[PDB]
Amino acid sequence: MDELGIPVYKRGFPEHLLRGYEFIIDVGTKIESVGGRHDVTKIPEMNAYDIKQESIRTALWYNPIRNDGFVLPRVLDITLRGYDERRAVVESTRHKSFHTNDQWVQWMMKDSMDAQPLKVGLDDQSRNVAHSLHNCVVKIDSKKADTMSYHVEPIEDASKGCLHTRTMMWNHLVRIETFHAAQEVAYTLKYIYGRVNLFDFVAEPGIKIVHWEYRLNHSTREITYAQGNPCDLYPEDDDVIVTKFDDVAYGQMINEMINGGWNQEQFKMHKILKSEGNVLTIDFEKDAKLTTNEGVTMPEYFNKWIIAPMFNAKLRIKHEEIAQRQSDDPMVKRTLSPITADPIELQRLTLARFYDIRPALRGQALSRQQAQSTYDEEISKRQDYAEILKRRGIVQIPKKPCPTVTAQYTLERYALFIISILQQHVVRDCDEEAVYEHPKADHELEIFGESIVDISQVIILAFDLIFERRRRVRDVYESRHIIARIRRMRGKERLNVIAEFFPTYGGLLNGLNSATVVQNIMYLNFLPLYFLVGDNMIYSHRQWSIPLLLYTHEVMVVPLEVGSYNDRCGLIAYLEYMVFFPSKAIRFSKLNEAQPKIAREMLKYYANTTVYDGGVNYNVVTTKQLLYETYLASLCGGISDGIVWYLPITHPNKCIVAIEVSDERVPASIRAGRIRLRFPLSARHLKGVVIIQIDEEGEFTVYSEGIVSHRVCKKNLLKYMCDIILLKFSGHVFGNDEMLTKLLNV
Ligand SMILES: [Zn+2]
């Protein structure tokens, strides 16, 4: 009750002796610094928050097995907001009783990229759960322990334009494939030939390969709204193969569909293209035959361009000299005439049989300091960099951007691009006599004012703006639960929680039994946007294809595989077809006979598709937050260790006090502000914040906010001696109850 003290001792203070206290700082066993950073490399050795030592993209996919299980940093905030928001419901006697939304708190608990896996140094002669940390071992009495977690933070470095609260967002980018560097697929002799991935080809410049060139058939037509950027199937270019839709197969598909409903399993994009020579079937290891005579016969397209208008692609194979030799950091383009740098271009290369991507990071997972991958500075030279960064509130401009700068760039330009693409499928009411460059992003676009941080946010926004005309971005948790809640339902009820959040939109696909013109059917294409993307999901089975309408002159319903002929997920799978939309005349057409029934089938298919559902490895995928935290610390930084744990207070009001032990490097107050950040929606309960800051020399120094009040003083049991940080909470009883376990078990 009222004031705890926390003794902080260096060996050899016995601590047989200190067990009376509830929290202890042993300053003690330090980890030596390797000047001037203190070295993350010892982490797998100390205990720790396990991160095996490894080249960093194979840290991403890592498992982890040296922990004792996972704490979530926000579990306290999760259930404080859980408890704050209970429904009242009147009882049989007229008393209220308060029901937890205990299913939003389940969903909120899973679906949490925070989670970190720690190894504690738990001993069996005392009840104490030790956490090693670079300057001290902190030992919490187990009753207080459940909330404790690291609050590691890499040093913001102003020349790089750092903003490290965006770390999570970075990690989220990588998970949804928008931080990768690319490279076209390549072959060599190992039938003869065989694919060889270019990131690690270990070959000197001046040696030949065969490699797919792969450009957009043409990004950015100069289109006018009476036209549409319809994807005409008949380019008039000499001596290039074009891929054609096969009418007899496509007709059979549509009849199977109008009768038996849409078939995700058995419908296929490759199946409705004429074989000579369709992009989805052709292969190179299986097409350059041995043969018998006279030999070395390359497949009949081996220098020709192959325009593929449905995919807006234009890939051709070739012999090509490589450059730049091998190196460990994509993007260093691995050949003369390579494939594109800019990340929103890669979002457009639907066919992904033709290139490999790995996330653009470089080197050891635990390094105290290493040169950054060049990808950031390479995104930086992009035109439209300065202009899109201004929306981010970055007035100019890092010369060697930290990843989070280019994370911010990437996700903001991405959002602009997805909206400028999608705005075309709604009706527009403006002069069609105004040419404009079509799939250009807007920059001047008006949206405000919760800053973009998640594609789920961009999706909620695609509907909120295109349909609701609510030009406003929702909080990341509100949107992730919006999508989660749409997916959670099937059948008609899924259509009810759409049109609960987007009433005009669902209110206009609820209505499609009317649907006279093609414009009315045209709204179905937005549907894939729920099921197609998120940092933590994998497709139930990639190679299922979901229905879509591409707009050539006549509105064909293609199946697009999710995705994308390369087990990548997602929003590549889908986004690029959407860059085609009908000419205004095709956009009024007044349907025909089969179109209403195809649309009824499409919406009925999405109404209960579960294509997003295939089970993720939660253990692998959510756990990586501390990996990016310390890796990024190596890129700028270095790191600053620190655990925080929350001490519940129970009178007069029920309220949390964060207590925080940490490295001396970043100043206490800013660290306290960041502490308040782990309460995205419950900050109001966090009523005061102690921050003990142990020096590298073992020279600690407290700091505190409201409700708490520290005062340091020596304790001298005979020869043995050490400081006890007293912590008065004047006016607040806080002791004898299961407050913490009540607080969590909400
Ligand atoms: Zn940085």
Q: What is the DSSP string of 10-30?
A: -TT--SSTTTTSSEEEETTSP
Do 563 and 707 lie in a common domain?
no
Residue numbers followed by a gap, the chain, C–N over 2.5 Å: 190
∠ CA 429-425-465, rounded to 5°: 80
The token duo for 680 is 């995205």
155 CA distance to ligand 1 centroid (A)?
Answer: 7
632 CA distance to ligand 1 centroid (A)?
Answer: 6
The token duo for 66 is 């040296």
Q: Evaluate whether 51 touches 365 at the Cβ level (below 8 Å).
A: yes
Cα gap 36→381, rounded to integer Å:
32
199 CA distance to ligand 1 centroid (A)?
Answer: 25
Cα gap 43→98, rounded to integer Å:
45
Question: 315 in helix, strand or coil?
Answer: coil
637 CA distance to ligand 1 centroid (A)?
Answer: 7
Give the residue from 601, 623, 645 where a domain finishes. 623
Question: 321 in helix, strand or coil?
Answer: strand
Question: 346 in helix, strand or coil?
Answer: helix
Structurally, how many domains does the chain consist of?
A: 3
635 CA distance to ligand 1 centroid (A)?
Answer: 7
Question: 722 in helix, strand or coil?
Answer: strand
361 CA distance to ligand 1 centroid (A)?
Answer: 13
Q: Evaluate whether 226 touches 584 at the Cβ level (below 8 Å).
A: yes
Cα gap 688→611, rounded to integer Å:
45
Q: Evaluate whether 313 touches 356 at the Cβ level (below 8 Å).
A: no
Cα gap 431→584, rounded to integer Å:
11
150 CA distance to ligand 1 centroid (A)?
Answer: 19
Residue indicated by tokens 């229905």:
547
Q: Evaluate whether 498 touches 526 at the Cβ level (below 8 Å).
A: no
Domain range spanning residue 744? 1-49+121-162+624-746
362 CA distance to ligand 1 centroid (A)?
Answer: 15
Cα gap 453→480, rounded to integer Å:
11
Cα gap 398→650, rounded to integer Å:
47
Give the residue from 604, 623, 642 where a domain finishes. 623
What backbone phi and psi angles, to 5 degrees, belong to 228? -155, 0
Q: Evaluate whether 454 touches 476 at the Cβ level (below 8 Å).
A: yes
CA atoms within 13 A on the CB side of 186: 27
Pairing of strands 686-694, 655-663: parallel
Q: Evaluate whether 129 touches 97 at the Cβ level (below 8 Å).
A: no
Cα gap 120→131, rounded to integer Å:
5
360 CA distance to ligand 1 centroid (A)?
Answer: 15
Do 327 and 207 lie in a common domain?
yes
Q: Rounded to the nearest 10 degrees, how much is the dihedral formed by the CA atoms of 548, 550, 556, 557?
A: -10
* Bridge partners of residue 187, in order along the sequence: 195, 210
218 CA distance to ligand 1 centroid (A)?
Answer: 36
Q: Evaluate whether 539 touches 570 at the Cβ level (below 8 Å).
A: yes
What backbone phi and psi angles, to 5 degrees, belong to 727? -130, 80
Q: Rounded to the nearest 10 degrees, how much is the dihedral formed by the CA atoms of 464, 469, 475, 479?
A: -10
The token duo for 237 is 């270019």
Cα gap 516→518, rounded to integer Å:
7
- The DSSP element (H or E) to which 739 belongs, if any, is helix 739-744
Q: Evaluate whether 131 touches 138 at the Cβ level (below 8 Å).
A: yes
Cα gap 581→522, rounded to integer Å:
9
What backbone phi and psi angles, to 5 degrees, belong to 116? -120, 145
Residue indicated by tokens 């993007």:
331
Query: Omega of the bond prior to 117 within 30 degrees of 0, cis?
Result: no
What backbone phi and psi angles, to 5 degrees, belong to 687? -95, 0
On whether 430 is known to bind a ligand per the annotation, the reply is: no
On whether 134 is known to bind a ligand per the annotation, the reply is: no
On whether 636 is known to bind a ligand per the annotation, the reply is: yes
Strand residue runs (E) in 255-377: 316-321, 355-359
Q: Evaluate whether 136 touches 28 at the Cβ level (below 8 Å).
A: yes
402 CA distance to ligand 1 centroid (A)?
Answer: 4
Cα gap 299→459, rounded to integer Å:
42
Where do runs of H (alpha helix) occur along 189-342?
Answer: 247-260
445 CA distance to ligand 1 centroid (A)?
Answer: 27
Residue indicated by tokens 């325009």:
307
680 by Cβ neighbours in 10 Å (0-12 / 13-18 / 19+) ranks as: middle
665 CA distance to ligand 1 centroid (A)?
Answer: 16
Do 214 and 107 lie in a common domain?
no
Question: 258 in helix, strand or coil?
Answer: helix
393 by Cβ neighbours in 10 Å (0-12 / 13-18 / 19+) ranks as: exposed
Do 176 and 300 lie in a common domain?
yes
670 CA distance to ligand 1 centroid (A)?
Answer: 16
- The DSSP element (H or E) to which 741 belongs, if any, is helix 739-744
153 CA distance to ligand 1 centroid (A)?
Answer: 10
184 CA distance to ligand 1 centroid (A)?
Answer: 30
Q: Evaluate whether 550 touches 580 at the Cβ level (below 8 Å).
A: yes
Residue 720 one-letter amino acid: Y
Cα gap 183→212, rounded to integer Å:
10
Residue 632 one-letter amino acid: L
Cα gap 658→648, rounded to integer Å:
9
531 CA distance to ligand 1 centroid (A)?
Answer: 32
Q: Evaluate whether 691 touches 673 at the Cβ level (below 8 Å).
A: no
Question: 713 in helix, strand or coil?
Answer: strand
Over the range 455-465, which residues count as b (16 or more CB within 10 Å of their CB) and which as e?
A: bbbbbbbbbbb
Q: Evaluate whether 245 touches 309 at the Cβ level (below 8 Å).
A: no
47 CA distance to ligand 1 centroid (A)?
Answer: 26
677 CA distance to ligand 1 centroid (A)?
Answer: 18
Where do runs of H (alpha helix) occur along 234-301?
Answer: 247-260
158 CA distance to ligand 1 centroid (A)?
Answer: 8
- Exp. method: cryo-EM
Q: Evaluate whether 662 touches 642 at the Cβ level (below 8 Å).
A: yes
How many CB atoms neighbour CB 110 within 10 A?
13
- The DSSP element (H or E) to which 686 belongs, if any, is strand 686-694
405 CA distance to ligand 1 centroid (A)?
Answer: 8
Cα gap 588→590, rounded to integer Å:
6
Cα gap 327→335, rounded to integer Å:
12
Do 563 and 436 lie in a common domain?
yes
Over the range 57-95, which residues count as b (16 or more CB within 10 Å of their CB) and which as e?
A: bebbebebebbeebbbbbbbbbbbbbbeeeeeeeeeeee
Do 581 and 650 lie in a common domain?
no
Cα gap 538→61, rounded to integer Å:
14
Cα gap 530→553, rounded to integer Å:
27
565 CA distance to ligand 1 centroid (A)?
Answer: 35
Do 698 and 569 lie in a common domain?
no
Do 143 and 178 lie in a common domain?
no
Question: 685 in helix, strand or coil?
Answer: helix
Cα gap 451→265, rounded to integer Å:
39
58 CA distance to ligand 1 centroid (A)?
Answer: 21
625 CA distance to ligand 1 centroid (A)?
Answer: 15
Question: 708 in helix, strand or coil?
Answer: coil
Q: Evaluate whether 263 touches 255 at the Cβ level (below 8 Å).
A: no
Do 145 and 270 lie in a common domain?
no
Strand residue runs (E) in 705-745: 709-715, 722-728
Cα gap 432→246, rounded to integer Å:
33
164 CA distance to ligand 1 centroid (A)?
Answer: 6
The token duo for 524 is 């179905």
Question: 526 in helix, strand or coil?
Answer: helix
Q: Evaluate whether 185 touches 353 at the Cβ level (below 8 Å).
A: yes
577 CA distance to ligand 1 centroid (A)?
Answer: 35
The token duo for 437 is 């460059």
One-character DSSP codes across 368-423? SS-PPPTHHHHHHTSTTHHHHHHHTT--S--SS--HHHHHHHHHHHHHHHHHHHHG
Cα gap 662→665, rounded to integer Å:
9
Cα gap 94→89, rounded to integer Å:
10
448 CA distance to ligand 1 centroid (A)?
Answer: 25
DSSP 474: P
Q: Rounded to the nearest 10 degrees, how much is the dihedral formed by the CA atoms of 102, 104, 109, 112?
A: 180
Where do runs of H (alpha helix) occur along 140-281?
Answer: 142-145, 167-175, 247-260
How many CB atoms neighbour CB 319 within 10 A?
11
Q: Which of 288, 299, 284, 303 is nearest to 240 (CA)?
A: 303
190 by Cβ neighbours in 10 Å (0-12 / 13-18 / 19+) ranks as: exposed
Question: 547 in helix, strand or coil?
Answer: strand
Cα gap 348→218, rounded to integer Å:
11
Residue 532 one-letter amino acid: L
Cα gap 468→460, rounded to integer Å:
10
Angle between helices 167-175 and 403-422 (to 10 degrees): 50
400 CA distance to ligand 1 centroid (A)?
Answer: 10
Do 64 and 173 lie in a common domain?
no
166 CA distance to ligand 1 centroid (A)?
Answer: 9
Q: Evaluate whether 368 touches 130 at the Cβ level (below 8 Å).
A: no
What backbone phi and psi angles, to 5 degrees, belong to 726? -75, 145
How many CB atoms neighbour CB 353 within 10 A?
15
57 CA distance to ligand 1 centroid (A)?
Answer: 18
Do 109 and 145 lie in a common domain?
no
Residue indicated by tokens 């020709």:
304
Q: Which of 7, 13, 36 is nearest to 663 (CA)?
A: 36
- The DSSP element (H or E) to which 646 belongs, if any, is strand 642-649
Do 577 and 680 lie in a common domain?
no
Q: Evaluate whether 740 touches 734 at the Cβ level (below 8 Å).
A: no
- Rg from Cα positions in the chain: 29
Q: Rounded to the nearest 10 degrees, how much is the dihedral formed by the CA atoms of 628, 630, 632, 635?
A: -150
Q: Which of 261, 235, 186, 78 is nearest to 656 (CA)?
A: 78
What backbone phi and psi angles, to 5 degrees, belong to 148? -65, 135
On whether 151 is known to bind a ligand per the annotation, the reply is: no
Angle between helices 625-635 and 167-175 (to 10 degrees): 110
Q: Evaluate whether 8 touches 725 at the Cβ level (below 8 Å).
A: yes
Pairing of strands 136-140, 556-561: unpaired
Cα gap 138→8, rounded to integer Å:
9
325 CA distance to ligand 1 centroid (A)?
Answer: 29
Give the residue from 589, 623, 657 where a domain finishes. 623
Cα gap 299→320, rounded to integer Å:
17
Question: 5 in helix, strand or coil?
Answer: strand
440 CA distance to ligand 1 centroid (A)?
Answer: 29
Q: What are the angstrom distances between the C-alpha of 261 and each of 272, 402, 524, 604?
A: 18, 49, 16, 8
367 CA distance to ligand 1 centroid (A)?
Answer: 15
What backbone phi and psi angles, to 5 degrees, belong to 326? -90, 155
Residue indicated by tokens 């000499």:
238
208 CA distance to ligand 1 centroid (A)?
Answer: 38
Cα gap 655→684, rounded to integer Å:
9
